[PDB]
Amino acid sequence: TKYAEGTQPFTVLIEGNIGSGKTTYLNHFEKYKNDICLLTEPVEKWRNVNGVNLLELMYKDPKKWAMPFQSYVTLTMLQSHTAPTNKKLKIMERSIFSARYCFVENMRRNGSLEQGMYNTLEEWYKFIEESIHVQADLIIYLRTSPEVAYERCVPLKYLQELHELHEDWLIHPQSCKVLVLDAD
Amino acid sequence: TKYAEGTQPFTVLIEGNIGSGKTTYLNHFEKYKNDICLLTEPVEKWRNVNGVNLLELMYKDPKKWAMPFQSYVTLTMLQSHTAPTNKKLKIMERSIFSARYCFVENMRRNGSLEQGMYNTLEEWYKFIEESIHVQADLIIYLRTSPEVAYERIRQRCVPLKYLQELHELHEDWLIHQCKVLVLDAD
Numbered sequence: 001t002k003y004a005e006g007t008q009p010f011t012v013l014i015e016g017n018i019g020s021g022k023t024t025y026l027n028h029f030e031k032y033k034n035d036i037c038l039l040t041e042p043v044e045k046w047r048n049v050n051g052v053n054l055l056e057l058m059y060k061d062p063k064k065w066a067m068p069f070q071s072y073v074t075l076t077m078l079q080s081h082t083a084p085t086n087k088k089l090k091i092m093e094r095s096i097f098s099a100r101y102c103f104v105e106n107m108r109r110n111g112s113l114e115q116g117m118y119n120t121l122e123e124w125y126k127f128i129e130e131s132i133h134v135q136a137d138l139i140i141y142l143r144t145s146p147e148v149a150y151e152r153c154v155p156l157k158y159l160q161e162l163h164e165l166h167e168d169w170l171i172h173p174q175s176c177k178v179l180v181l182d183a184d
Numbered sequence: 185t186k187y188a189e190g191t192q193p194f195t196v197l198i199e200g201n202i203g204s205g206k207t208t209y210l211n212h213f214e215k216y217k218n219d220i221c222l223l224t225e226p227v228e229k230w231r232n233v234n235g236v237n238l239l240e241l242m243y244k245d246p247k248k249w250a251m252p253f254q255s256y257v258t259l260t261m262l263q264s265h266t267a268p269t270n271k272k273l274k275i276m277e278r279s280i281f282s283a284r285y286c287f288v289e290n291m292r293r294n295g296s297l298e299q300g301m302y303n304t305l306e307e308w309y310k311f312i313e314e315s316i317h318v319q320a321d322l323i324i325y326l327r328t329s330p331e332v333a334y335e336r337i338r339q340r341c342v343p344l345k346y347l348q349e350l351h352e353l354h355e356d357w358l359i360h361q362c363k364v365l366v367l368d369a370d
């Protein structure tokens with residue numbers, strides 16, 4: 001009864017802070033193109049919504065554009081999450097879950113998302129779990145230290161905030177199995 | 185395969201401009217509470233999102249709040265559209281369709297919704313039709329004239345130009361091409 005229920009293979013979610021080596025990690029699998037479904041984070045889509053670059057706009061003026069940006073990120077995640085495939089294994093770089101628990105939650109904390117905006121997104125997150133099937137069998141957490149992530153130009157404080165949020169979500173509900181890797 | 189597919193009875197959508205008499209029309213059915221599922225426009229939800237009054241905020245500063253407001257409207261619409269019921273007939277005041285084709289579209293035209301915002305909502309509207317079943321068997325269009333609507337409201341306050349814009353949009357969607365039933369609400 002939920003959309004895309006029973007249409008997805010075993011699904012692996014690569015999660016990690018900015019600069020935890022996620023793109024590198026997903027590339028290792030590229031020689032298996034033919035047997036694995038590989039979906040990188042849809043940044044390209046965020047950079048071009050029928051011509052509009054939502055990513056730049058968000059950097060430019062977060063108070064105004066964080067809401068539409070995160071709303072759109074959420075959508076793209078669903079698009080990946082529910083995309084059909086005949087492959088027997090599927091790996092995604094980030095997910096609806098990182099978007100909600102890390103990026104949106106952080107924007108609330110630093111007040112990029114005002115109360116009304118945050119709540120609209122949250123209400124959508126709740127409706128999404130009732131209505132849309134998000135296949136998630138294993139998270140692979142490329143755990144790092146904010147400082148190491150820093151070496152590979154977002155501020156360091158931001159990376160620490162995001163680090164704590166990934167730590168809260170993945171180490172300290174979701175009874176999906178997590179696999180911690182030292183990416184230091 | 186779409187959410188809420190096969191879960192809904194015959195559904196009637198009451199559409200109309202602001203002040204076309206929609207609330208009055210839905211009330212006629214209230215004596216059939218027991219046999220008809222009656223869902224008024226979720227204004228109450230818009231007025232209180234865990235405490236936040238999105239309706240108010242929108243009126244005060246549309247450039248900022250139109251996006252989250254319409255995003256939330258869309259959601260509430262889906263909530264009504266997909267709500268389960270054992271009744272054999274269901275009537276909604278407004279719908280995801282009016283919110284998309286009239287209110288959102290109008291906010292684009294008058295630049296309350298900047299290009300990026302409008303597009304995010306549209307992308308969501310497209311995903312919503314792929315993924316979520318919206319039961320709609322009959323629209324009842326309470327057709328009126330902007331002037332009469334302006335009147336009916338003034339007596340009961342939207343500017344008149346807004347009601348005209350909305351009127352044209354309802355006209356485009358419902359008249360100048362689900363079965364539609366036009367009523368003269370003048």
Ligand SMILES: Cc1cn([C@H]2C[C@H](N=[N+]=[N-])[C@@H](CO)O2)c(=O)[nH]c1=O
Nearest residue numbers: 018041043073094098099100103104
């Ligand atoms: C998944 C996700 C990424 N992002 C940002 C962080 C990254 N910034 N840089 N450089 C960018 C690409 O991952 O998008 C976001 O703001 N919200 C989100 O939900």
Ligand SMILES: Cc1cn([C@H]2C[C@H](N=[N+]=[N-])[C@@H](CO)O2)c(=O)[nH]c1=O
Nearest residue numbers: 202227254257278282283284287288
């Ligand atoms: C359905 C809908 C209503 N509205 C507004 C118009 C109405 N304004 N007044 N008075 C209010 C209640 O219908 O909500 C909106 O802005 N977007 C929508 O999608």
